[PDB]
Amino acid sequence: GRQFGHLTRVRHVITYSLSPFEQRAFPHYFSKGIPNVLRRTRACILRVAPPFVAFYLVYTWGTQEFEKSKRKNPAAYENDR
Amino acid sequence: GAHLSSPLASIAATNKLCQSFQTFNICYADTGLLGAHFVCDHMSIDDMMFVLQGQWMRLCTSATESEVLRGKNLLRNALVSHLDGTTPVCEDIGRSLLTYGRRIPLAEWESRIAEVDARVVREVCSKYFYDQCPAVAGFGPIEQLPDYNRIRSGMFWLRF
Protein backbone atom coordinates (compact mmCIF):
# COMPACT_ATOMS: atom_id res chain seq x y z
CA GLY A 1 0.00 0.00 0.00
CA ARG A 2 1.70 3.13 1.20
CA GLN A 3 4.98 2.38 -0.31
CA PHE A 4 7.65 3.03 2.28
CA GLY A 5 5.65 2.57 5.44
CA HIS A 6 4.12 -0.86 5.64
CA LEU A 7 6.00 -3.18 3.28
CA THR A 8 7.87 -5.58 5.57
CA ARG A 9 8.56 -5.94 9.27
CA VAL A 10 12.20 -5.95 10.27
CA ARG A 11 14.01 -5.71 13.59
CA HIS A 12 17.58 -5.54 14.87
CA VAL A 13 19.30 -4.58 11.64
CA ILE A 14 21.85 -1.79 11.65
CA THR A 15 23.17 0.34 8.80
CA TYR A 16 26.19 2.63 8.40
CA SER A 17 27.10 5.08 5.65
CA LEU A 18 28.90 8.36 4.99
CA SER A 19 28.45 11.65 3.21
CA PRO A 20 29.38 11.10 -0.44
CA PHE A 21 31.87 13.93 -0.06
CA GLU A 22 33.61 11.99 2.68
CA GLN A 23 34.78 9.46 0.12
CA ARG A 24 36.22 9.02 -3.35
CA ALA A 25 34.66 8.40 -6.74
CA PHE A 26 37.23 5.73 -7.65
CA PRO A 27 38.65 3.88 -4.67
CA HIS A 28 41.12 1.87 -6.77
CA TYR A 29 38.58 1.52 -9.54
CA PHE A 30 41.36 0.54 -11.91
CA SER A 31 43.53 -1.73 -9.80
CA LYS A 32 41.03 -3.35 -7.49
CA GLY A 33 38.23 -3.48 -10.04
CA ILE A 34 40.00 -5.26 -12.90
CA PRO A 35 40.14 -8.65 -11.10
CA ASN A 36 36.44 -8.51 -10.31
CA VAL A 37 35.84 -7.95 -14.02
CA LEU A 38 37.82 -11.07 -14.81
CA ARG A 39 36.64 -13.56 -12.21
CA ARG A 40 32.95 -13.41 -13.11
CA THR A 41 33.47 -13.11 -16.86
CA ARG A 42 34.36 -16.78 -17.00
CA ALA A 43 31.27 -17.98 -15.12
CA CYS A 44 29.29 -16.76 -18.12
CA ILE A 45 31.73 -17.50 -20.95
CA LEU A 46 31.34 -21.12 -20.01
CA ARG A 47 27.66 -21.00 -20.93
CA VAL A 48 27.74 -18.11 -23.43
CA ALA A 49 29.97 -18.91 -26.41
CA PRO A 50 29.18 -22.52 -27.40
CA PRO A 51 26.27 -21.74 -29.74
CA PHE A 52 27.97 -18.70 -31.29
CA VAL A 53 30.55 -21.17 -32.45
CA ALA A 54 27.89 -23.29 -34.11
CA PHE A 55 26.46 -20.58 -36.33
CA TYR A 56 29.78 -19.20 -37.51
CA LEU A 57 30.80 -22.75 -38.32
CA VAL A 58 27.58 -23.46 -40.17
CA TYR A 59 27.81 -19.93 -41.49
CA THR A 60 31.04 -20.69 -43.29
CA TRP A 61 30.16 -24.37 -43.62
CA GLY A 62 27.09 -23.54 -45.63
CA THR A 63 28.93 -20.65 -47.23
CA GLN A 64 31.46 -22.99 -48.78
CA GLU A 65 28.79 -25.64 -49.24
CA PHE A 66 26.79 -22.95 -51.01
CA GLU A 67 29.69 -21.68 -53.09
CA LYS A 68 31.00 -24.71 -54.96
CA SER A 69 27.48 -26.09 -55.26
CA LYS A 70 26.62 -22.93 -57.16
CA ARG A 71 29.89 -21.42 -58.25
CA LYS A 72 31.03 -24.04 -60.71
CA ASN A 73 28.68 -25.22 -63.43
CA PRO A 74 31.27 -27.45 -65.16
CA ALA A 75 32.09 -28.91 -61.77
CA ALA A 76 30.62 -32.41 -61.77
CA TYR A 77 29.35 -32.18 -65.35
CA GLU A 78 32.22 -30.68 -67.23
CA ASN A 79 31.76 -29.33 -70.68
CA ASP A 80 32.56 -32.50 -72.48
CA ARG A 81 28.87 -33.06 -72.77
CA GLY B 1 -2.69 24.65 21.09
CA ALA B 2 -2.41 25.88 17.51
CA HIS B 3 -2.13 29.63 18.20
CA LEU B 4 1.44 29.51 19.51
CA SER B 5 4.01 31.70 17.82
CA SER B 6 6.53 28.94 17.16
CA PRO B 7 5.72 27.62 13.67
CA LEU B 8 6.67 24.16 14.90
CA ALA B 9 4.54 24.23 18.05
CA SER B 10 1.79 25.58 15.79
CA ILE B 11 1.96 22.83 13.17
CA ALA B 12 3.10 19.96 15.39
CA ALA B 13 0.05 20.62 17.56
CA THR B 14 -2.15 21.30 14.53
CA ASN B 15 -1.59 18.11 12.55
CA LYS B 16 0.26 16.38 15.44
CA LEU B 17 3.03 15.62 12.99
CA CYS B 18 5.10 14.55 15.97
CA GLN B 19 4.43 13.58 19.52
CA SER B 20 6.99 16.07 20.77
CA PHE B 21 10.39 17.46 20.11
CA GLN B 22 13.03 19.66 21.63
CA THR B 23 16.21 21.20 20.32
CA PHE B 24 19.54 20.83 22.06
CA ASN B 25 22.82 22.64 22.25
CA ILE B 26 25.98 21.00 23.52
CA CYS B 27 29.27 22.79 23.06
CA TYR B 28 32.36 20.80 23.89
CA ALA B 29 35.76 22.33 24.60
CA ASP B 30 36.50 22.64 20.89
CA THR B 31 33.13 21.50 19.60
CA GLY B 32 29.41 22.25 19.67
CA LEU B 33 26.22 20.42 18.85
CA LEU B 34 23.12 21.97 17.34
CA GLY B 35 20.06 19.99 16.40
CA ALA B 36 16.79 18.61 17.60
CA HIS B 37 15.27 15.39 18.86
CA PHE B 38 11.76 14.46 17.84
CA VAL B 39 9.29 11.61 18.07
CA CYS B 40 6.57 11.08 15.51
CA ASP B 41 4.35 8.39 14.05
CA HIS B 42 5.98 5.76 11.88
CA MET B 43 3.99 7.13 8.98
CA SER B 44 4.49 10.75 10.09
CA ILE B 45 8.29 10.88 9.93
CA ASP B 46 8.89 12.50 6.53
CA ASP B 47 6.55 15.35 7.16
CA MET B 48 8.17 16.34 10.43
CA MET B 49 11.40 16.66 8.49
CA PHE B 50 10.27 18.63 5.47
CA VAL B 51 8.91 21.03 8.03
CA LEU B 52 12.04 21.10 10.14
CA GLN B 53 14.31 22.02 7.26
CA GLY B 54 11.89 24.85 6.58
CA GLN B 55 12.62 26.64 9.83
CA TRP B 56 16.41 26.53 9.80
CA MET B 57 16.64 27.42 6.14
CA ARG B 58 14.13 30.26 6.26
CA LEU B 59 16.02 31.76 9.21
CA CYS B 60 19.27 31.91 7.24
CA THR B 61 17.64 34.22 4.73
CA SER B 62 14.26 35.74 5.34
CA ALA B 63 14.21 36.11 9.12
CA THR B 64 13.06 39.29 10.84
CA GLU B 65 13.85 41.45 13.84
CA SER B 66 10.40 41.14 15.37
CA GLU B 67 10.64 37.44 16.15
CA VAL B 68 14.19 38.19 17.28
CA LEU B 69 12.74 40.07 20.22
CA ARG B 70 10.44 37.31 21.41
CA GLY B 71 13.45 35.03 21.28
CA LYS B 72 15.60 37.65 22.98
CA ASN B 73 13.28 38.08 25.95
CA LEU B 74 12.93 34.36 26.62
CA LEU B 75 16.63 33.69 26.86
CA ARG B 76 16.94 36.59 29.28
CA ASN B 77 14.23 34.96 31.35
CA ALA B 78 15.69 31.46 31.12
CA LEU B 79 19.09 32.90 32.01
CA VAL B 80 17.83 34.78 35.05
CA SER B 81 15.55 31.87 35.90
CA HIS B 82 18.13 29.13 36.36
CA LEU B 83 20.20 31.42 38.61
CA ASP B 84 18.06 30.86 41.70
CA GLY B 85 19.07 28.29 44.30
CA THR B 86 22.22 27.35 46.17
CA THR B 87 23.45 24.37 44.17
CA PRO B 88 22.92 25.78 40.64
CA VAL B 89 24.72 28.95 41.69
CA CYS B 90 27.41 26.77 43.24
CA GLU B 91 27.35 24.59 40.15
CA ASP B 92 27.98 27.23 37.48
CA ILE B 93 31.31 28.14 39.00
CA GLY B 94 32.88 24.70 38.68
CA ARG B 95 32.29 24.23 34.99
CA SER B 96 32.67 27.95 34.33
CA LEU B 97 36.05 27.76 36.02
CA LEU B 98 36.90 24.67 34.02
CA THR B 99 35.42 26.52 31.04
CA TYR B 100 35.88 30.28 31.06
CA GLY B 101 37.64 30.34 34.37
CA ARG B 102 36.21 32.44 37.16
CA ARG B 103 34.03 34.27 34.69
CA ILE B 104 30.45 34.65 35.85
CA PRO B 105 29.92 37.72 33.62
CA LEU B 106 26.38 38.03 34.94
CA ALA B 107 25.45 41.57 33.98
CA GLU B 108 27.68 41.22 30.94
CA TRP B 109 25.54 38.36 29.64
CA GLU B 110 22.86 41.00 29.36
CA SER B 111 25.25 43.28 27.52
CA ARG B 112 26.12 40.21 25.47
CA ILE B 113 22.43 39.84 24.68
CA ALA B 114 22.30 43.38 23.35
CA GLU B 115 25.02 42.38 20.91
CA VAL B 116 22.96 40.01 18.77
CA ASP B 117 21.59 41.31 15.48
CA ALA B 118 19.39 40.26 12.59
CA ARG B 119 22.34 40.04 10.25
CA VAL B 120 24.28 38.40 13.07
CA VAL B 121 21.92 35.45 13.43
CA ARG B 122 21.59 35.15 9.67
CA GLU B 123 25.32 35.56 9.15
CA VAL B 124 25.94 33.09 11.97
CA CYS B 125 23.48 30.49 10.72
CA SER B 126 24.73 31.03 7.18
CA LYS B 127 28.00 29.56 8.39
CA TYR B 128 26.79 26.61 10.35
CA PHE B 129 23.73 25.51 8.39
CA TYR B 130 23.50 26.48 4.76
CA ASP B 131 24.95 23.75 2.56
CA GLN B 132 26.60 21.59 5.18
CA CYS B 133 26.98 17.89 5.93
CA PRO B 134 24.52 16.92 8.68
CA ALA B 135 24.70 13.88 10.90
CA VAL B 136 21.76 11.48 11.12
CA ALA B 137 20.97 9.16 14.01
CA GLY B 138 17.96 6.88 14.00
CA PHE B 139 16.14 4.21 15.97
CA GLY B 140 13.42 1.96 14.58
CA PRO B 141 10.75 1.69 13.18
CA ILE B 142 12.69 4.15 11.06
CA GLU B 143 12.12 2.83 7.63
CA GLN B 144 10.13 5.76 6.24
CA LEU B 145 13.01 8.11 6.94
CA PRO B 146 14.35 9.15 3.54
CA ASP B 147 17.81 8.33 2.32
CA TYR B 148 20.65 10.70 3.10
CA ASN B 149 20.88 12.00 -0.46
CA ARG B 150 17.52 13.65 0.02
CA ILE B 151 18.48 15.28 3.33
CA ARG B 152 21.66 16.57 1.75
CA SER B 153 19.97 18.19 -1.22
CA GLY B 154 17.41 19.25 1.35
CA MET B 155 19.92 21.28 3.30
CA PHE B 156 20.54 23.93 0.66
CA TRP B 157 17.43 25.50 -0.76
CA LEU B 158 17.19 25.93 -4.49
CA ARG B 159 15.70 29.33 -3.49
CA PHE B 160 12.41 27.55 -2.94
UniProtKB/Swiss-Prot annotation, chain A:
It holds the Pfam family UcrQ. The modification N6-acetyllysine is found at K32. This is Cytochrome b-c1 complex subunit 8. Keywords: Acetylation, Electron transport, Membrane, Mitochondrion, Mitochondrion inner membrane, Respiratory chain, Transmembrane, Transmembrane helix, Transport. Component of the ubiquinol-cytochrome c oxidoreductase, a multisubunit transmembrane complex that is part of the mitochondrial electron transport chain which drives oxidative phosphorylation. It is found in: Mitochondrion inner membrane. Its main location: mitochondrion. PANTHER family: CYTOCHROME B-C1 COMPLEX SUBUNIT 8, UBIQUINOL-CYTOCHROME C REDUCTASE COMPLEX UBIQUINONE-BINDING PROTEIN QP-C. The modification N6-succinyllysine is found at K32. Belongs to the UQCRQ/QCR8 family. One of its GO terms (biological process) is mitochondrial electron transport, ubiquinol to cytochrome c. GO terms for cellular component: mitochondrial inner membrane; respiratory chain complex III. Residues 1-38 are mitochondrial matrix. The lineage of its organism: Eukaryota, Metazoa, Chordata, Craniata, Vertebrata. Residues 68-81 are mitochondrial intermembrane. It is a single-pass membrane protein. Gene3D superfamilies: Cytochrome b-c1 complex subunit 8 (1.20.5.210). The chain crosses the membrane at residues 39-67. Component of the ubiquinol-cytochrome c oxidoreductase (cytochrome b-c1 complex, complex III, CIII), a multisubunit enzyme composed of 11 subunits. The complex is composed of 3 respiratory subunits cytochrome b, cytochrome c1 and Rieske protein UQCRFS1, 2 core protein subunits UQCRC1/QCR1 and UQCRC2/QCR2, and 6 low-molecular weight protein subunits UQCRH/QCR6, UQCRB/QCR7, UQCRQ/QCR8, UQCR10/QCR9, UQCR11/QCR10 and subunit 9, the cleavage product of Rieske protein UQCRFS1.
UniProtKB/Swiss-Prot annotation, chain B:
It is found in: Mitochondrion inner membrane. It comes from the Eukaryota. Component of the ubiquinol-cytochrome c oxidoreductase, a multisubunit transmembrane complex that is part of the mitochondrial electron transport chain which drives oxidative phosphorylation. Component of the ubiquinol-cytochrome c oxidoreductase (cytochrome b-c1 complex, complex III, CIII), a multisubunit enzyme composed of 11 subunits. The complex is composed of 3 respiratory subunits cytochrome b, cytochrome c1 and Rieske protein UQCRFS1, 2 core protein subunits UQCRC1/QCR1 and UQCRC2/QCR2, and 6 low-molecular weight protein subunits UQCRH/QCR6, UQCRB/QCR7, UQCRQ/QCR8, UQCR10/QCR9, UQCR11/QCR10 and subunit 9, the cleavage product of Rieske protein UQCRFS1. Belongs to the peptidase M16 family. UQCRC1/QCR1 subfamily. This is Cytochrome b-c1 complex subunit 1, mitochondrial. It comes from Bos taurus. The gene is UQCRC1. The chain holds residues 321 to 480 of 480 of the full protein.
